[PDB]
Amino acid sequence: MLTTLIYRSQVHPDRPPVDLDALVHRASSKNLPLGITGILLFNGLQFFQVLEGTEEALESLFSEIQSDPRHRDVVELMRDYSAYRRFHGTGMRILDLRLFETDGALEEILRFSTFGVTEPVNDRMFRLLSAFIADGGRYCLPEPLQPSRWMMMAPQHLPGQPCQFALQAIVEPAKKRVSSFEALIRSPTGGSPVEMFAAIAAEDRYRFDLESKAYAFALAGQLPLGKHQLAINLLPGSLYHHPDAVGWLMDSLLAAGLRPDQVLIEVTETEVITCFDQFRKVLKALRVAGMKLAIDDFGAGYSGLSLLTRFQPDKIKVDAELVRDIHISGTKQAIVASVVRCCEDLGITVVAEGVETLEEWCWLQSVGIRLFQGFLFSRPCLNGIGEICWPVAR
Amino acid sequence: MLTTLIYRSQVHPDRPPVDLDALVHRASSKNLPLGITGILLFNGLQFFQVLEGTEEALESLFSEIQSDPRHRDVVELMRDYSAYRRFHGTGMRILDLRLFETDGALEEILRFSTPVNDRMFRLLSAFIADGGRYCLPEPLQPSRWMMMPATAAPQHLPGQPCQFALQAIVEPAKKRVSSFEALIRSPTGGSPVEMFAAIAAEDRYRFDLESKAYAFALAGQLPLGKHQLAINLLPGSLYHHPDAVGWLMDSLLAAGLRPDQVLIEVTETEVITCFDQFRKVLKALRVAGMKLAIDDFGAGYSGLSLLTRFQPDKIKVDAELVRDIHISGTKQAIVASVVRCCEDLGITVVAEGVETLEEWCWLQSVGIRLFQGFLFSRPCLNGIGEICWPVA
Ligand SMILES: Nc1nc2c(ncn2[C@@H]2O[C@@H]3COP(=O)(O)O[C@H]4[C@@H](O)[C@H](n5cnc6c(=O)[nH]c(N)nc65)O[C@@H]4COP(=O)(O)O[C@H]3[C@H]2O)c(=O)[nH]1
Ligand SMILES: Nc1nc2c(ncn2[C@@H]2O[C@@H]3COP(=O)(O)O[C@H]4[C@@H](O)[C@H](n5cnc6c(=O)[nH]c(N)nc65)O[C@@H]4COP(=O)(O)O[C@H]3[C@H]2O)c(=O)[nH]1
Ligand SMILES: Cc1cc2nc3c(=O)[nH]c(=O)nc-3n(C[C@H](O)[C@H](O)[C@H](O)COP(=O)(O)O)c2cc1C
Ligand SMILES: Cc1cc2nc3c(=O)[nH]c(=O)nc-3n(C[C@H](O)[C@H](O)[C@H](O)COP(=O)(O)O)c2cc1C
Ligand SMILES: [Ca+2]
Ligand SMILES: [Ca+2]
Ligand SMILES: [Ca+2]
Ligand SMILES: [Ca+2]
């Protein structure tokens, strides 16, 4: 089946310039018998290629292209089935954009391509070509944020308690500063939140979730919570199904030597969106009391910015699923970059969670993320503050 | 009950400068007895004001401020309940940002206010860093524009179980019609609800699919030429027949249309409710060469995370985000993020439901170039309606 594949990449700046003549000649020669057509764009610093052909032919070729030493930061932009070849023709063409003025390069593309009966601008491939021509440097990863320039540099369990908590740091690597700690519930045997709640009767789960937080506050109070923030996780129902959950939390966090402004409630985006009715009175009370709110798991499931017209949280936590393979995904890059910007405009804090690799950290930072949470920096620490690994140069 | 209200605005650059010392002195003196506090930031062009007080007091005060001819382009950025007063003991106070070096204004703020973990503070910082971002440019002032009158030729067609009205999606910059949307109508010319209410509940998906034959017929006999055509379809209509896509292909071809010329609009909510099933249908549409749009984007709550799952050719911003976008910083921020994301992904964006020059001008300022609404063109029963263009 005819498939389209579009990616962008960049050259190595400190290495000799790539021989584009040898590249394009061997490309067009190899592509012809395999039925692979398209076009290569080059602006001096970045490549942008369109590839058309069978699914299996492009999968094979793109694997080789990903392994190629002549470029790096290969970012996939589009991959879809196609009704016709836009670049009919027997050879990989190259367009050196440095030789064209304002809109001469688009003019040049329409000499070797057709985009159906309607205006070319109605075609996604053409719009992507235009965007790279207009401003290809936008998602060009800066030199200082190249992963290769970076490298990475006790507590007891409490079985007698009906539940215990692990603390994971949210960090700001640019200031080597810990922003806050998230409390994650653990079972008496050190099990996961799934195991903990599975051991509780379905009819008592909401109440348990709320009441478990007294132990999270006690832990934070015993630890030097020196002006750091404490995030806790609650389901909407846990706050909702209680005559006064806000007052309950208030009394509990007050007793533990904490302040209202120091406690942030994380609620999953999926379960907040599904019950707008009940949530707003609870959210209001949380606000008036002075506690902060975060929208958790932002990007996972059903999760949008239109939510923000109804109410605006203090913080949004970008889900690990958008963080996964962000370095190779143009789609995730564009979404995360857009969320970051919207949050800046609205004065909402953004945290990228589930950060496991320097690649993720570098690319997340390139689109404006400054607060991070993940195994790269600090893993959850049962009943204590874990060690933090900071990225350092070389 | 304490409330916080924040807005940004702009001076009239052609008019004499306002005496801000007098304005602020009068403001501070009036505000404090009424239990109102806050600050005013000025960068030479724009104002940024924080107001704290009861819901009643800020409502009354903001109404006056909105009517004040000393400024324009008043955009509300925040209105929410507050736990405490940030500017206790300060009726009103102006910080002229041109009198400060980097972070000087912010540092002074902290000395008389009562930090990066507060939304008001982050907004203050954001205005100081890049206050001009959502400043409406001078050429895009509604006063610098005027809608011109265009005749339509609507016809009632008999021998049909349904009819279709056509509404143009336009690109005002190029005085160009991008596409026409087919909107189903009853045999008597009534609304979609009226049409579907006369069909048995169980026959609605089938009827929705089969009705598209008459939309293709209308487009074909228009003639459509090189223009695109939205139809609308529910996912269930597309699931109704095993080869619904195959049937659409035959019907559009017989009407003298091309696959790449036909675009299927599916509502945001109905797509996410079934990722299952939809992918097989989407696959067939792409292979056949028809295009897909996500309609009512921002109504199904909603957003850009769906783009990891598939990506449509087009998204159409829901009318709720369009409404009063000129006075809502929140809608402005959301619409701008959708525009920027879709631009990066090469997805066309249409602002739907545009009724005023104010909406059009502000949508244009956040990057939208394709528009659908009564401002430009109303739905025309079985025909191409008249189009109005804004002129400078
Ligand atoms: N793969 C990967 N994972 C990372 C990384 N960094 C952190 N994580 C983990 O991802 C989860 C983050 O919490 P969450 O997204 O709020 O998702 C949490 C949260 O929803 C939750 N949860 C935790 N405590 C509570 C609670 O007290 N009440 C409720 N309702 N839910 C809770 O259960 C979910 C699963 O929790 P956890 O087992 O604690 O697992 C944690 C955590 O340890 C990373 O770099 N890579
Ligand atoms: N206030 C205002 N309204 C504006 C403006 N511009 C356009 N509209 C209108 O908003 C609707 C736009 O179509 P929609 O969002 O798809 O919303 C449509 C669409 O969902 C729909 N529909 C139309 N045809 C079909 C169909 O064949 N099948 C299905 N399933 N739904 C259809 O029923 C809905 C109701 O459609 P309509 O009466 O045609 O109403 C149209 C339209 O006339 C404006 O500037 N201001
Ligand atoms: C920007 C870029 C574009 C490329 N395009 C193609 C191409 O279209 N066709 C191709 O066969 N190889 C292409 N390559 C080269 C492949 O990565 C790889 O070197 C080649 O397929 C190896 O096959 P060979 O040794 O049998 O010639 C490209 C490499 C880069 C850096
Ligand atoms: C940028 C801006 C900020 C203003 N802030 C206040 C204010 O905080 N308090 C106030 O009473 N009037 C404020 N005003 C003035 C009001 O719009 C209005 O002129 C005044 O409240 C009328 O009341 P008066 O008749 O007692 O003067 C502001 C005007 C502008 C242009
Ligand atoms: Ca969480
Ligand atoms: Ca998560
Ligand atoms: Ca529609
Ligand atoms: Ca709509």
PDB file of N, CA and C in Angstrom, chain A residues 34 115 212 319 331 335-336:
ATOM      1  N   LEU A  34      13.092   0.218  -6.307  1.00  0.00           N
ATOM      2  CA  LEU A  34      12.232  -0.072  -5.155  1.00  0.00           C
ATOM      3  C   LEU A  34      10.909   0.700  -5.188  1.00  0.00           C
ATOM      4  N   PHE A 115      -0.891  18.040  -6.561  1.00  0.00           N
ATOM      5  CA  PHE A 115      -1.597  17.906  -5.282  1.00  0.00           C
ATOM      6  C   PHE A 115      -3.117  17.833  -5.452  1.00  0.00           C
ATOM      7  N   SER A 212      -5.994   8.728  54.016  1.00  0.00           N
ATOM      8  CA  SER A 212      -4.603   8.289  53.920  1.00  0.00           C
ATOM      9  C   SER A 212      -3.634   9.472  53.980  1.00  0.00           C
ATOM     10  N   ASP A 319       1.876  14.355  30.998  1.00  0.00           N
ATOM     11  CA  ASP A 319       1.994  12.925  31.249  1.00  0.00           C
ATOM     12  C   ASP A 319       3.221  12.322  30.572  1.00  0.00           C
ATOM     13  N   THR A 331       5.215  15.189  16.459  1.00  0.00           N
ATOM     14  CA  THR A 331       3.869  15.365  16.998  1.00  0.00           C
ATOM     15  C   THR A 331       3.900  15.705  18.487  1.00  0.00           C
ATOM     16  N   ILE A 335       2.938  19.307  20.327  1.00  0.00           N
ATOM     17  CA  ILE A 335       1.916  19.320  21.376  1.00  0.00           C
ATOM     18  C   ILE A 335       2.475  19.879  22.680  1.00  0.00           C
ATOM     19  N   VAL A 336       3.631  19.368  23.096  1.00  0.00           N
ATOM     20  CA  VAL A 336       4.246  19.779  24.355  1.00  0.00           C
ATOM     21  C   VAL A 336       4.684  21.249  24.293  1.00  0.00           C
TER      22      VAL A 336
END
